[PDB]
Amino acid sequence: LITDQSREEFDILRYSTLNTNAYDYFGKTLYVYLDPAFTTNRKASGTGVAAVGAYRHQFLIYGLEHFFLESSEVAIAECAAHMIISVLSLHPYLDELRIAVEGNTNQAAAVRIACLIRQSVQSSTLIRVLFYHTPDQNHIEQPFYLMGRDKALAVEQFISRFNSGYIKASQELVSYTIKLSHDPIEYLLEQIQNLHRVNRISDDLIIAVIMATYLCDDIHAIRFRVS
Amino acid sequence: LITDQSREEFDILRYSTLNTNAYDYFGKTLYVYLDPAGTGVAAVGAYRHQFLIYGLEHFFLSESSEVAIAECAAHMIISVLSLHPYLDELRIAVEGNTNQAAAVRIACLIRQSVQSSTLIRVLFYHTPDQNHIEQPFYLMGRDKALAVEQFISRFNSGYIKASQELVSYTIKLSHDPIEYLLEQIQNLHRSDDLIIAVIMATYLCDDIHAIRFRVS
């Protein structure tokens, strides 16, 4: 499934973006994805956030969060926003944000969360923010993304990119909810090992990386619109 | 000539070995080349089919130059070995163009300082001279052009990288060793004492040379 050489190179070969001021080859757009977590009542998992950008033909992971909880929606949005602001701060060449917020069962909450994220970001820094928009009932666009047939293409595309060296972490990777307990990349590797094609091995951060990387292509570029 | 993109990668993509604890596809051999007089020193080893640089010195010549030089090469080797305990053999080549005798005394001093500090297997490149007695020096001749060509081809392909935790006591801290090496890389065609040491050190990692290295 996943190569040993590719897992090992992802760990020991990370990009030190801070070592250079020559940005010609970096993508200027930060893609992020999150899947805010509610389920019912019980103590379950958390919420995966990932932030990625292009470098030549590669994709670079700038940020990871795996967040566990008063307003769940504010805590969630704030932890996404805080990661994004640090990332923008570390990589000034980044001049646009494109954000997808999964709303699969609870789309009202994903609406509000999108709106809260755009709020913290814009309070802190001047940048254009775009959200993945999808049609709803009376055919009106709403700032959410829906997982569906996509997930298989995305998973299968990740596995193939990772195996061939296309997925890389940066050295200055931001993670306020992981870094104090683990190297975030070692944590993310534990999940990459748990990957199958398509019952209690968490997979939330890895899917978030799979999806941020996936919505990178131009096939999705019109879906992103001012929220 | 070296490609623009290869130089950029070399700058922004460095090995961090301390993130791993497995080790099965490292070489456990540190290859060191120095050419005494500046005197350039480099230390490299393998990761799979590629190469990384663990240490670099460029060392400037009261007296006892030989002792001084040996102690400089030896200090970097100690530090590099001390930071990478999976490394368990040293293969050293001391270049001897014109002064075979001094290269031989420096080999012996380097061996002594390394073995007073740490338990490790230590081999030197050997060359037969006059009486066909195998001696611990290396003679550059016409192989130099060949080492420069392979290095250009490997560097352009991305096969040669620095380690994050690169040791240099002679260059490091008013200069970044990578920067200073990059300036030499940018500069040659067919002072450069440092990039020559890196070229020859990665050239001597091939299996074809393994049999010239012996316990001295």
Ligand SMILES: [Mg+2]
């Ligand atoms: Mg630099």
Ligand SMILES: [Mg+2]
């Ligand atoms: Mg969900």
Ligand SMILES: [Mg+2]
């Ligand atoms: Mg690790």
